[PDB]
Design a protein around this ligand. Structure first.
Ligand SMILES: NC(=O)c1ccc[n+]([C@@H]2O[C@H](COP(=O)([O-])OP(=O)(O)OC[C@H]3O[C@@H](n4cnc5c(N)ncnc54)[C@H](O)[C@@H]3O)[C@@H](O)[C@H]2O)c1
Ligand SMILES: NC(=O)c1ccc[n+]([C@@H]2O[C@H](COP(=O)([O-])OP(=O)(O)OC[C@H]3O[C@@H](n4cnc5c(N)ncnc54)[C@H](O)[C@@H]3O)[C@@H](O)[C@H]2O)c1
Lengths: 364, 364
């Protein structure tokens, strides 16, 4: 072993996944949980399965001395404030902070300065990359099987935003926008696969279908439910994101395609069985499509049954935690830094502005 | 029966497909072929299989008195000139004119005026819609199985521009640009499926891979080989086109998806036999993906063996000619008018400007 005491700031749905995944990793002990909602604590405690000290407020937790490391899985607009507390705390602990790291540019601007002066690891929890199918595509791109890389397409086709606590995931004011909230993953993936930095974004999107029967003090959701985004990079590579939140019918929730000048590669990621028909479970597919001699190659990508049953992310949360652990113990780097978190968000924020004011947006 | 005498102005590769398809349609007689290149004439005649009168120049053909209707399958920048001759000819005849109808805005502007004062049918040969797979998508969109329609995605993944006669298809000056030349069909498809008009268009693209090694008086092809295009419509529907001319590896050359608020529908078009592996004759698929009860429905869509062997367009050219026949006999409408042809071109021209400038462009 070699034990790490973990504290959870925020004890909702994703917290419980972090729990189930920490359960598979020896050396991992949860010792403190913070949540302003007792019903959330009761359920999260039940899931953990052992005795832990609870707090309604994270400040009491920070100075409790029960924890070697933190996990933040509270609503998006809370994230910066909690971090500012962690940064100004005497103790100075590692943090895994759920995405989005930020929800506005004011925050991004502020966070950027503070994080520079902090001495403990900060990892932004964008796990998508450790999905085994996506891992293949990343190594295939990086290692040269595609030749020189130019195009990258991501298509997400999925169900409407789920029902959460105090319905915080309904308004842009609280989420950063659909493209920040659900899409910072894909904007980071772009940077990772293309090995490049964005120069420009343009998007078209609407709120066309969803959440039209929900009032919250008389108001309907102001958020996007579909969009097309186009990103240009400093070397002239280009990428595109397509989103529909009313395409749950799709066997495959994500489709990721990368074209280079020697070959093309695509992956098809199924819907989580927890969201699909029971029995009609599908396995993920990767297709390698070379130009040079015509002859595409398809193959299923399997994971571990336990790791996959640990969450709704095809085992990725597990690996994410293996990474975080290593970094705490100085046996690996932070793979997903604040910087990364901030680019992913500024990318979404830019995209949101573009839909609003019918112009592209420059990135710095 | 009722026999129709057809004249072909231009006798290259597509002309021979027009021939092969006219061969399947009873009542179709070719009587005159025009081409400045006798190599082209002798092969096109060989294909026809019977005796016909040839001309080097289309003007002699127009006043030959052998023809009830015309087909234009010459290089793009010739198209307006030939039409001006047809429009001013004493005997005013029906015309099927290959796409692009135009190559510049000056021409679009001019053609628009002239074609209004011409009294014979003018049909722009964008046959894509009659591909049986695509037909299902259009009826499904129009007829309501998708609910209200919002998104349309087109992915073309194909080979570099081919070697043509006197190599006319290499410079923007002669083609109108890649987005005009090879993409006007998809811009028309958008208008057709969405049943709407574009308000705005934006694209990112480059010349990144292809034709770095053909010189024409010392100069390299100045044409795009990949792009992402985004179109917004007057009702808030949107569409996006992805093009790579270096993705010949792809089993499926086209992928079309349409998302509405009850269901999604996709079609996959294989590479034409003549361009694919020998033996690997894959068929097109259509997948219906409802939201309401999860349960996707897939099925292969066949074309007739002869109709499929008659062309490189999944049988579409045949149906196109069934329509053109009716219009010649004044028993049927022009399904694809000059107006349609002109929007398709202006859409590409707009997209070309957008890549160049860096801003979206307004459409009227
Ligand atoms: N990594 C991923 O794949 C992924 C997936 C979904 C959600 N998330 C992120 O997880 C976070 C929310 O988790 P969820 O989706 O389970 O939502 P949830 O509503 O189920 O959980 C949020 C919890 O935070 C509590 N809370 C509210 N305000 C708080 C505060 N100021 N401090 C601490 N806790 C507070 C709520 O009472 C609730 O118990 C968001 O940042 C969201 O973006 C990440
Ligand atoms: N699916 C489609 O709709 C499709 C497919 C292929 C080509 N096309 C169109 O067909 C045209 C090109 O035909 P192709 O691809 O078979 O090319 P090609 O180069 O193989 O044949 C073109 C022929 O036109 C002749 N020609 C040149 N100048 C002429 C003139 N002034 N008058 C008459 N004939 C002339 C050439 O000598 C040659 O014989 C273009 O407009 C192209 O966009 C359409």
């Amino acid at each position: 072993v070699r034990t790490i005491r973990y504290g959870l700031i925020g004890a909702g749905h994703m917290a419980r996944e972090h729990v189930r995944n920490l359960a598979l990793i020896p050396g991992s002990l949860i010792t403190a949980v913070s949540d302003p909602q007792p019903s959330s604590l009761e359920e999260t405690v039940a899931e953990i399965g052992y005795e832990v000290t609870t707090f309604p407020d994270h400040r009491e937790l920070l100075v409790s001395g029960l924890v070697d490391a933190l996990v933040i899985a509270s609503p998006n607009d809370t994230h910066l404030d909690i971090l500012k507390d962690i940064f100004s705390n005497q103790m100075k602990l590692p943090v895994l902070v759920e995405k989005p790291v930020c929800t506005t540019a004011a925050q991004a601007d502020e966070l950027e300065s503070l994080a520079a002066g902090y001495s403990a690891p900060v990892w932004v929890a964008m796990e998508y990359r450790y999905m085994p199918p996506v891992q293949e595509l990343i190594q295939a791109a990086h290692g040269g099987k595609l030749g020189n890389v130019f195009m990258l397409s991501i298509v997400e086709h999925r169900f409407p935003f789920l029902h959460k606590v105090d319905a915080w995931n309904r308004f842009n004011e609280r989420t950063g926008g659909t493209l920040v909230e659900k899409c910072c993953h894909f904007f980071d993936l772009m940077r990772l696969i293309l090995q490049d930095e964005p120069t420009r974004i343009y998007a078209s999107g609407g709120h066309d279908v969803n959440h039209m029967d929900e009032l919250y003090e008389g108001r309907v959701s102001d958020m996007i439910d579909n969009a097309y985004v186009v990103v240009d990079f400093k070397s002239g590579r280009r990428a595109m994101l397509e989103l529909s939140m009313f395409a749950e019918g799709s066997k495959f929730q994500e489709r990721i395609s990368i074209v280079g000048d020697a070959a093309k590669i695509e992956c098809l990621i199924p819907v989580a069985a927890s969201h699909w028909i029971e029995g009609d479970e599908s396995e993920a597919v990767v297709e390698f499509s070379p130009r040079s001699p015509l002859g595409p190659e398809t193959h299923e990508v399997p994971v571990d049954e336990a790791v996959l049953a640990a969450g709704a992310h095809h085992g990725s949360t597990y690996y994410e935690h293996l990474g975080y652990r290593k970094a705490i113990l100085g046996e690996g780097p932070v793979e997903v830094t604040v910087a990364d978190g901030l680019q992913s968000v500024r990318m979404g924020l830019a995209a949101e502005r573009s839909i609003i004011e019918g112009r592209p947006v420059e990135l710095l």
